Each structure stands twice: as C-alpha cells, then as structure tokens.
C-alpha cells in the first residue's frame, strides 16, 4: 500500500506488450500494491511506446498510480525498486546467419551503470534479454554499488516448460509437478533436472522418475523437447513466445515478492559465488533456490549423480567461455 | 461446476492473443468454472493456432478442459454458451480518409446464420469486430431463433477510456470514477456522458462536473479525446487496440456473468427496441446498463439536457446511416 517503481525495458517489444497488463492487474506484486510504471525503449520506438502508453491507461487499472515512457536512462533508472530488463536486439544465428550477438552486452553495462547511478541500492534487477545469463553477469559488474544477490536472470520459462512436458506425459497437471530444476545457462545447454521432482499421483506424491518409468526419455528427448520449445513455438506462431514468457516473468518476480511455497523450490539464474555444487564462482548460473523476504537461498546438499554432474559441467564451461567472451567486448579488464 | 464452450473468433490475431490468457485464468468466468475453449480462424491460420495451443500448455491453465482450433464452423459454433466475435479486418490508417470497412459485414451475417444453426439458443453473443454496432445488428438479424436480447457489442473500451480521462484529470484512480455512460456509436460520434457520474474525493463523492470545475473541458476537449482515442493509438503503434480492447472484452463479459456491482451501471451496445430515451428503434446503440442474472436492463429516468440530446441524436443518425449502407451491400452484387 504505497507506490513502487517498476521499469520494463524493451517496452515496445513483444514480450513487454503481454507483460505490462499483468503487472498492471496486480498479478505480480499485490492487489494491494500500487505501481508506477516506467517504460523504456529506443528513440525510434517512442511513437509506438506512446501508443502502448495510451493503452495502459485505457485499461483503467486502479493499481497504476502513474505510467511513464522514456528514451532517457535518468528517468528510466531513477529511484527504482524493480527493474525488468527485456531490452536487447533479437537473438539468433551465429553463422547460419548473425555471427555473434554478443554486443547486446555493451547494453547491460550501460544499464548496470545507470542502475548503479540512479536506482535505489535495493533495486531488484531481473534480466530477460538474451543471452540472459551473460548480460546479467555483465550487468552486475557494472553495478558495484548494487548487491550481487539482487540480480537474477530468467530460467522460469524453461522451468515452466519442463513441468508442462511432464504433465503431458503422465496425464496430470502442471500444477501437480514440484521441484523441477533448471541448471546453468538459459540455453542449448540448460539441464532440466527431474531427479528431484515430485508428482501428485493418486493421493500420493510419487516422484518423476518413479512415475514416468521411462529413464532414457527423461535423459534425452525430454531434455530436447524443453530446449527446442522456444523455436517450436516460433515455428508455428511465427512470433515471439510472448504470452508464455510474460507468464514466466510474472512468476519469477511474484516468487521474489512473496517467497516460494512451502516444501518447494524454483529455478533462477543467480551468482554462483560460494556454491556448494562445484560450479565455478563469479558465474551467472541457474540453481534451485528458495526465497523468503526477497532473498534467495540456494537449496543445498541435493544428491548429484553422474548424468547430472556432467550436464552441469558442460553448461558451466559454456557460461565460462561467454564470460571470457563478453569481457573484451566490455570497456574494462 | 461444469464447463461451458466459449468461442473466440479471429483466434490467431492480435486481440485474441491478448485476451486468451485471461479467459484461461478463471478471471472472466470464475475460478471454479471450466471452459472448453473453441478457437476459430481461417484455414491459412491453423499453424499459428497450433502455436498458440502450444503456449496455452506452457501457461498452466487447468480451467481449459479442452482447446479446439478450427476452420469449420459446423465445428466452431456448435453448442456454444458464449461466442466472442473478434474475427475481421482491423482499421488501418486511411482510417482517417474513409472507413467503409464493408469488408466486414458479410462475416457477421454468415456467422449469425451459423449461430442460428449450431449454437445453444441461449448463447450470449459478444461482438468486437468493427464497426461494432453495425456488425452486431447484421448478426442478430440472421439469427431469428436467438433472442435479440442475447446480442451486445463492445463499447467498454470506450467506457474505460472516459473513466481514464477523468482519473488523469482529477488525479484519482480509475476505481474512483463511477457511472459513466457511453452513448451511441462506437465511433467518433459516441457521447462520453458525465452528467450522472460520481467521483470519490477524500472529502466526498461528487459529481464529475463539480469535482472537475471546468465545463468547457468536459463539453469540449474531454469529449474530443475520448472520441478520437482509437485513432490516436493506431497512429502511434501502427496497429489498433489490443491490450486495452482485450481487457475490455473481459470487463464486458464479466459484468454479464456476475452482474454489475450495485449503484454502478456500465455501457453496453444492446438492441434499441423500446428506449425511454428518444432513440429510434431497431438499432444497435450503446446505453447505460444494469445486469442481473446475465440479463441487462437499461437505466431509466436519467434526465437528458439539450447538449446531451444533441449528442445522442447525432449518433443515432450515423447508426442509421450505417445500417443503410450495410443492408444495401448485403443485398447487392
Ligand atoms: N530468458 C528467456 O526465457 C527468454 C525467452 C524469450 C525471449 N527472451 C528475450 O527477451 C527479449 C525480448 O524479446 P522480444 O520478443 O520481446 O523482442 P522484440 O524485438 O519484440 O522487442 C524488443 C524491444 O527491445 C527494444 N530495444 C532495443 N535496444 C533497447 C535498449 N537499449 N533499451 C530498451 N529497449 C531496447 C527494441 O526496440 C524492441 O522494442 C529478447 O532478448 C528475447 O530474445 C528471453
Ligand atoms: N470495438 C472495439 O472496441 C475494437 C477495438 C479494437 C479492435 N477492434 C476490431 O476487432 C477486430 C480484430 O482486430 P485485431 O487487431 O484483433 O486482429 P488482426 O487483424 O491482427 O487479426 C484478427 C483475425 O481475424 C481473422 N479473421 C478474418 N476473417 C475471419 C473469418 N471469416 N473467420 C474467422 N476469423 C477471421 C484474421 O485471420 C485475423 O487472424 C478488428 O475488426 C478490429 O477493428 C474492435
């Protein structure tokens, strides 16, 4: 019950258009939490942005005390509590086309630095624009004034996907599926881990492996399914996976705002420093986490097998290489 | 506790894309009400829908007992409880040249017969495809077996537009504006009426006219803005209302399902037949509504000044005008 300043960058893009509404409804921070919405995008997008601004008013949301559009970072980053960084230039290729979209990192240095300057030192930063993990890390080195801990990336999307896959298989509901784990990079190397998942079956919560009875599946194509998903959806829709990614973002923040449910944990890419898994420190890696008062704690002491350890080694090495790679991009060593 | 079939035409378009997450949520028909979501589009859009079906799974929406995508309307219209008719051509600039999007009228006529043939005679038809009013008349006309009372078109984007203009102005919240009335055509000739509205100030609930203290504003530039809004968004985004229009369908549909709150009346485009307000009969005109048991009632005994008559007459003439055009097109070749 008192205005909170929320910034959504990339605000003229596709995910933002689906996301804004939901922030507005009070689906994220409280039916009791009034928001001040800050909208940021690129100059040439400022006409569309006003359009999108008109539309948030026309929704006539009571929570929304104010709404702002901007091209300028002072306004954008001034006094925030929450920053959601969706902004970035569209992810693809490598050689099949766009060689190496790493210059999206020149953008988060610029954002971390702005966060550094104007934002409230308690600002929670959530990085959605890809490559999520490495822009977020990058954004954290530029924001030395803001804590390591309140920088996170999005993996929830992959985490929700995994759950939907499981449900499909067993013919239950995605709400019947606890403790899925997404490990590592939001990428082609993500490790959807169900060695620790549960599923309501009967009046029993059995256990993902127990339940599926088909191990090879959970260790292959299951993993593939979840990785392919973003492309598949774009394959069909021909557009951004907006409704589902906006939902995942909502969850990502809503879970930081209210905490995780009892007995359960969620995936969030955070800073590895002090990890108990054997994952290099000073990486922006995704882990099983629990959250109390806007504070995450890596779940610890989970049995980690052979398959899992390898998979977790592979995703680390890639994150590691993207870090080495962003660092000559970036303006300091 | 038993599913209803809800139809959403133009299910592979822009407003449908913003609306579907909110039907699926329980936030339109209730948290304890399952839907069998029927989706309709044109043959060439089926791959898109497949795509959208994909995101719907990823969105964990248990209320959705089923999701039917079709291009057959012996399929799409069959056994309906609610039909939501978005599907059609959207206005594009040179929306400010000529708007005889007549492109559209055949689709409503044909969809009404379909409704006649296949939907439950209790179906409640919600028409969104523009021109809202006139499409709604064409549809009801072709659906004799369905009680004309069952048809209403969308003017709640307008209603909320005006509420929104009041709020900015007074600096209250949307929730703080009440009993607004949108009269006539979903057009630049609509009338955002505030003679019967009430605002909630810290000291007391007052007339808008009284809180504002600027008649010229309300009789002039308040008016102008709400009637040119739709066109102002298209100029901005290069697309027409989606976020805001979706949000408003929800509202419209919700008041119907659970009734309007007491002391509160909403705008809805219902059949003219029998107004206590001087409006000609046999028109699809926006009036002030009360809803109890999914049945709307016009608000009567509201004194109409001259200024207000004027505005109401201006709009019933464009409605008429428009009717002439439609029914000439339909019986022409
Ligand atoms: N982490 C995940 O789960 C996940 C999933 C899907 C997409 N994403 C990523 O989220 C981001 C958004 O995707 P989209 O579909 O919304 O893209 P989009 O192309 O529709 O919109 C992106 C917007 O960013 C803007 N932009 C560019 N540079 C900017 C800057 N410096 N500041 C602010 N805005 C700026 C563009 O002008 C555009 O308006 C992309 O990085 C996308 O690949 C991540
Ligand atoms: N009255 C209002 O408040 C309001 C506000 C905004 C838009 N609209 C109108 O709503 C309609 C939707 O526009 P838009 O921006 O959502 O989407 P859009 O134009 O991007 O897509 C709408 C979809 O309708 C489909 N369609 C066309 N003919 C069809 C048919 N015969 N059967 C089924 N589907 C069919 C198209 O294939 C398209 O996928 C337009 O008429 C627009 O002008 C009304």
Return the active site residues of B. Answer: 186
* Of A27, A66, A21, A6, nearest in space to B174 by CA: A66
Is B15 labeled as ligand-binding? yes
CB proximity list for A236: less than 8 A, separation 6 or greater: B47, B48, B50, B51, B52, B54
User: From residue B4, how far is each of B34, B63, B96, B123 by CA, in Å?
Assistant: 7, 11, 40, 10
β-partners of residue A85 are A9, A127
Degrees (nearest 5) of the Cα angle A179, A198, A316?
A: 40
The three state secondary structure string of A293-310 is CCCEEECCCCCCCHHHHH
DSSP per-residue letters across A69-122? EES-HHHHHTT-SEEEE--------SSSS-----TTHHHHHHHHHHHHHTS-TT
Query: Quick check: B51 and B164 in contact, CB under 8 A?
Result: no
CA distance B112 to A55: 31
User: From residue B329, how far is each of A272, B100, B284, B322 by CA, in Å?
Assistant: 68, 11, 18, 11
User: From residue B196, how far is each of A13, A141, B206, B285 by CA, in Å?
Assistant: 40, 57, 10, 19
Tokens of B245: 């229009």
Residues in chain B: 333
β-partners of residue B127 are B85, B153
CB proximity list for A310: less than 8 A, separation 6 or greater: none
Radius of gyration of chain A (CA): 19
SS3 content of chain B, % helix, strand, coil (to 5): 45, 20, 40
Helix B46-58 / helix A221-237 crossing angle, nearest 10 deg: 130
Q: How was this structure determined?
A: X-ray
CA distance B317 to B333: 26
CB proximity list for B52: less than 8 A, separation 6 or greater: A236, A237, A243, B11, B12, B17, B20, B39, B69
DSSP per-residue letters across B65-77? EEEEEES-HHHHS
Q: Given an 8 Å threshold on Cβ–Cβ distance, is A18 in contact with B21?
A: yes
* Of A67, A74, A82, A69, nearest in space to A118 by CA: A74
Is B282 labeled as ligand-binding? no
Residue owning tokens 């989606």: B242
CA distance B127 to B269: 9
β-partners of residue A38 are A7, A68
CA distance B117 to B129: 21
Query: Quick check: A98 and A92 in contact, CB under 8 A?
Result: yes
CA distance B146 to B143: 6
Tokens of B197: 């509205």
Q: Given an 8 Å threshold on Cβ–Cβ distance, is B58 in contact with A161?
A: yes
Give A306 to chain B, closest Cα distance, Å.
29
According to DSSP, residue B265 is labeled: -
* Of A91, A61, A15, A50, nearest in space to A250 by CA: A15
Tokens of B40: 């309709």
Radius of gyration of chain B (CA): 19
Query: Quick check: A293 and A318 in contact, CB under 8 A?
Result: no
Name every chain A residue with its beta carbon within 8 A of the beta carbon of B58.
160-161, 164, 229, 233, 241, 244, 247
Query: What are the two backbone dihedrals, phi and then psi, of residue B282, each rounded to the nearest 5 degrees?
Result: 60, 45
Q: Ligand 1 — pocket residues by CB below 6 A?
A: A 9-10, 12-15, 40-42, 45, 86-91, 107, 128-130, 132, 154, 157, 186, 240-241, 245
Where would I find the H helices in B124-202? 132-141, 156-170
DSSP per-residue letters across A193-259? E-TT-EEEETTEE--HHHHH--HHHHTTHHHHHHHHHHHHHHHHHSS--HHHHHHHHHHHHHHHHH-
A217: CA distance to ligand 1 center in Å? 33
CB atoms within 10 A of CB A303: 7
**Alpha carbon of residue A82 to chain centroid:** 14
Query: What are the two backbone dihedrals, phi and then psi, of residue A200, each rounded to the nearest 5 degrees?
Result: -65, 120
**Alpha carbon of residue A200 to chain centroid:** 27
Nearest ligand (C-alpha, residue B92): 2
Query: Quick check: B296 and B268 in contact, CB under 8 A?
Result: yes
According to DSSP, residue B218 is labeled: I
CA distance A270 to A148: 8
Nearest to B243 among A50, A59, A164 (CB): A59
Burial class (CB in 10 A: 0-12, 13-18, 19+), A188: exposed
Is B94 labeled as ligand-binding? no
Residue owning tokens 């072709």: B142
A90: CA distance to ligand 1 center in Å? 6
SS3 content of chain A, % helix, strand, coil (to 5): 40, 20, 40
Interface of A with B (CB under 8 A): 17-18, 20-21, 47-48, 50-52, 54-62, 65, 160-161, 163-164, 168, 173-175, 229, 232-238, 241-244, 247
Q: Sketch out chain B's domains with CATH numbers.
A: 1-153 (3.40.50.720), 154-333 (3.90.110.10)
A188: CA distance to ligand 1 center in Å? 19
């Amino acid at each position: 019950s008192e205005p909170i300043r929320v910034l959504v960058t990339g605000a003229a893009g596709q995910i933002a258009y689906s996301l804004l509404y939901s922030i507005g409804n009070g689906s994220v921070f409280g039916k009791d939490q009034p928001i001040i919405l800050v909208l940021l995008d690129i100059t040439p997008m400022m006409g569309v942005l006003d359009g999108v601004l008109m539309e948030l008013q026309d929704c006539a949301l009571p929570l929304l005390k104010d709404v702002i559009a901007t091209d300028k970072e002072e306004i954008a980053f001034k006094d925030l509590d929450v920053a959601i960084l969706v902004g970035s230039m569209p992810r693809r290729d490598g050689m099949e086309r766009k060689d190496l979209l790493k210059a999206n990192v020149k953008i988060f240095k610029c954002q971390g630095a702005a966060l550094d300057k104007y934002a409230k030192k308690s600002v929670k930063v959530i990085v959605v624009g890809n490559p999520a993990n490495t822009n977020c890390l990058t954004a954290s080195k530029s924001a030395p004034s803001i804590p390591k801990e309140n920088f996170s990336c999005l993996t929830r999307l992959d985490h929700n996907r995994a759950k939907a896959q499981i449900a499909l298989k067993l013919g239950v509901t995605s709400d019947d599926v606890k403790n899925v784990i997404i490990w590592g990079n939001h990428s082609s190397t993500q490790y959807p881990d169900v060695n620790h998942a549960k599923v309501k079956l009967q009046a029993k919560e059995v256990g993902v492996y127990e339940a599926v009875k088909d191990d090879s599946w959970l260790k292959g194509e299951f993993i593939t399914t979840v990785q392919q998903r973003g492309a598949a959806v774009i394959k069909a829709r021909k557009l951004s996976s907006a409704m589902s990614a906006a939902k995942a973002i909502c969850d990502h923040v809503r879970d930081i705002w209210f905490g995780t449910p009892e007995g359960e944990f969620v995936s969030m890419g955070i800073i590895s420093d002090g990890n108990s898994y054997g994952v290099p420190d000073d990486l922006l890696y995704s882990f099983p986490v629990t959250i109390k008062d806007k504070t995450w704690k890596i779940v610890e002491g989970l049995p980690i097998n052979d398959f899992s350890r390898e998979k977790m080694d592979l995703t680390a090495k890639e994150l590691a290489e993207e870090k080495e790679t962003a660092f000559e991009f970036l303006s300091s060593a």
